[PDB]
């Protein structure tokens, strides 16, 4: 199981997405909820660095399955309309694949 | 990107 | 900062210590509140693996100042105790050294 | 271990 | 008033619930026939087998999950939680839902 | 099983 | 900014609205945020006191840019839609007006 | 007893 | 295992006491942390109506196992004194039967 | 009144 | 009864203070002084100006932190917080805490 | 600044 820890301040801001784990869908090479969620988180990151001024600090597990996105500046609704898209995002593959994917906010 | 990372 | 994040599930067990960002007290190789922080993480944690049945489920980023511990066998006693050891620790470099470390629970 | 690792 | 005291772990698991209190009322029926099906139903159509206590005098029932990762179990006491705040925002006098 | 006045 | 925050209780009834700070849209007495936040909230403190028996706790700063309602009787269904509508009326300021104004729950 | 320019 | 779940509010008033399950530890008739927790209970109980105005609302289930205490009077001190020494006085047994009786919090 | 095996 | 609402953020920090209602009042006295005295020394002992606002007529007073990280107007605010929870142990039913 | 009957 892949799982999505979120942290949703007082203000509504994200400023937190930990994601660890896998899937255990497929073997690797083949799992269709990490590539799903994969692609979801990767390009997300990307689109954060790539469209707004914002740069998050981030830590993964050069090979193992734990990334984690942390916001520097949470004022920035880009950044944040961002991370919202990619939760939605990891929510709709969690609707269909539940068993391979959790989110639990705060 | 790494595909099978999760 | 270094930030301490620390999850205790609804029957009391430490699931989660995730231990992010540097002390920035001193420059890297002299400072003492990341010295004090690191030798009480390592040392807990080879504490767990060397005196317990309990293999956590670990992640950093090998040169980062992220690392996330998370309970696999969170009824283990002694592993517990470890960490409550480990947290009374850090809480005690907190309680001098304020602006260089935060604990913040659940 | 790594002694300033945080 | 029925008070219904709703347990939620840190993984969205519902751990617990407990209904307490007293509402011819029909809010109490309703009460009624939503918690003991449920239970039943969680038992006929699932692998789970809660713990479960209540008082033979009534006004107290009190369901524990034992496999919080039976997603059935679950999905049918999110169902029974779905139907108790059903009634409540009509009787909001009669039931009180509370979080734990 | 079921009492419709339990509560 | 103008912060709004709304306490609602485990049932979804609206205990608290705390409504803050000023617009910062334009400069008194040209500022559109305001304006709109304002009729809002003061129509629907009318609306609840003219058209339910509800007679909420009301606190406010004379000088502005501060108001605070508080339910007494959570059981009136009236005041508690008029709330709701007051909510969904200042969401739909905020979806335009992301800057001016901010919701904040619990 | 209305404020437009309150908040 | 025995079960204490605890219920206190935010000004560390005891609203709730769940006390669920059994001991473990002997056989039905042999068991002494049952015992123990047993006379703890039911003592406490009895001195909370032999000793104050204050009338709980109680409920158990006759096969044993489970019990349900919560309160009415909250502002009654010598009722809370009186929950607070059960607690105290069960968390004495916890410190010496870790494994047999457990105590959580809110 | 008081069971001693109770929990 | 006065109550006490107070906010804590992730961080540990009190962003938002609270006291509304009424409690040759002494309860009042008591959490009026330490409410007021508070908030000077805040001002005069420390680098944070919190934002202020209060009902001309009694029974309303709110505080919050701009300054989140000013170690020293926490430390007050906790120490306000202590001191109202110390009149709270004593007179129950005049003063309510809570935590959002 | 203080008046002691505010609440
Ligand atoms: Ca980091
Ligand atoms: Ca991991
Ligand atoms: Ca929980
Ligand atoms: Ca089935
Ligand atoms: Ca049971
Ligand atoms: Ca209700
Ligand atoms: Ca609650
Ligand atoms: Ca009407
Ligand atoms: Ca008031
Ligand atoms: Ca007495
Ligand atoms: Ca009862
Ligand atoms: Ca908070
Ligand atoms: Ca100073
Ligand atoms: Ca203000
Ligand atoms: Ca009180
Ligand atoms: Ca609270």
């Known amino acids: ?106 | 990107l790494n595909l099978q990372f999760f």
Chains 1, 3, 7, 9 share one sequence.
């Open chain 1, 1 to 106: 199981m892949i799982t999505v820890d979120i942290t949703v301040n007082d203000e509504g801001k994200v400023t937190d997405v930990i994601m660890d784990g896998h899937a255990d869908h497929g073997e690797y090479g083949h799992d269709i909820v990490c590539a799903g969620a994969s692609a979801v988180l990767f390009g997300s990151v990307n689109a954060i660095i790539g469209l707004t001024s914002e740069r998050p600090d981030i830590n993964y597990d050069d090979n193992g399955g734990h990334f984690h996105i942390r916001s520097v500046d949470t004022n920035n609704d880009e950044a944040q309309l961002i991370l919202q898209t990619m939760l939605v995002s990891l929510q709709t593959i969690e609707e269909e694949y539940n068993e391979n994917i959790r989110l639990n906010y705060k």
